[PDB]
């Protein structure tokens, strides 16, 4: 690019996720993006991988890493969502080695 | 900015690089603990309550990079 | 990033860049979860399907860079 880039997006529902791909969606992943109707545009691309997925808490005002940019099918394509590593779900693991 | 060297690499024992990138996650234990500044600072990992409440349909996440 | 905007300085402080150092080539992204821990996509370090088996020796990281 030319400067760090930022893009905000909606966690999309299971069913709508599964429906957008041939590939097997697991418990460890989540899609996010605007449905083709929602008007708003944008997404992740290559070399974006690994990048963080963060959400700002209302409770405290600290950010949390919600997922990891895990995979796709192109970029900005109507009808396709972006797959994300479900951080909360591999946290026991993350625990284990850091504390190890 | 700051360049850093790696000491170790940890890959989810059950990554599925073979079927469908399931458990796509790796930890890189740095060599030398970095110093926080106004442009260097950790991020939070959630707890069962922040995930349950936040992880939701239409709830916006922010994404950043150089891709 | 497809159809985003340029961050503001300070905004994304956990923002870590996986690079190669041999010659230089940005590969992936990541985040600082600590002073001695980086969180990344497993498939950034190793995806055989595409010839990709980096080892510690293979990479360097750049903290706190925001173009």
């Amino acid at each position: 690019p030319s400067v760090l880039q930022v893009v905000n997006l909606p966690i999309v529902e299971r069913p709508v996720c599964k429906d957008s791909t041939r590939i097997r969606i697991t418990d460890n992943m989540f899609c996010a993006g605007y449905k083709p109707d929602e008007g708003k545009r944008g997404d992740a691309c290559e070399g974006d991988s690994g990048g963080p997925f963060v959400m700002k808490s209302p409770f405290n005002n600290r950010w949390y890493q919600m997922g990891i940019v895990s995979w796709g099918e192109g970029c900005d394509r109507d009808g396709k969502y972006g797959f994300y590593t479900h951080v909360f779900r591999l946290k026991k693991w993350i625990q284990k080695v850091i504390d190890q | 900015e700051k360049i850093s060297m790696l000491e170790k690499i940890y890959i989810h024992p059950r990554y599925n690089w073979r079927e469908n990138l399931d458990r796509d996650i790796a930890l890189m234990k740095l060599k030398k603990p970095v110093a926080f500044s106004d442009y260097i600072h950790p991020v939070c990992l959630p707890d069962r309550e922040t995930a349950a409440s936040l992880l939701q349909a239409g709830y916006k996440g922010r994404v950043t990079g150089w891709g | 990033i497809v159809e985003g905007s340029d961050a503001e300085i300070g905004m994304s402080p956990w923002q870590v860049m996986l690079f190669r150092k041999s010659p230089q080539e940005l590969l992936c992204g990541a985040s600082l979860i600590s002073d001695r821990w980086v969180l990344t996509a497993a498939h950034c370090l190793l995806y055989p399907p595409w010839d990709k088996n980096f080892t510690e020796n293979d990479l360097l990281v750049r903290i706190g860079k925001h173009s």
Binding site: K56, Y64 | H41, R62 | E8, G10
Partner: peptide, 28 residues
């Protein structure tokens, strides 16, 4: 323990240009 707070924003009691967008979208 000082995870997620950001020296150039949350510490200077400050806000970014699109962080209100994240917050409006939730329900706690």
């Amino acid at each position: 323990a000082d995870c997620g707070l950001r020296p150039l924003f949350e510490k200077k009691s400050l806000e970014d240009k699109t962080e209100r967008e994240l917050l409006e979208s939730y329900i706690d």
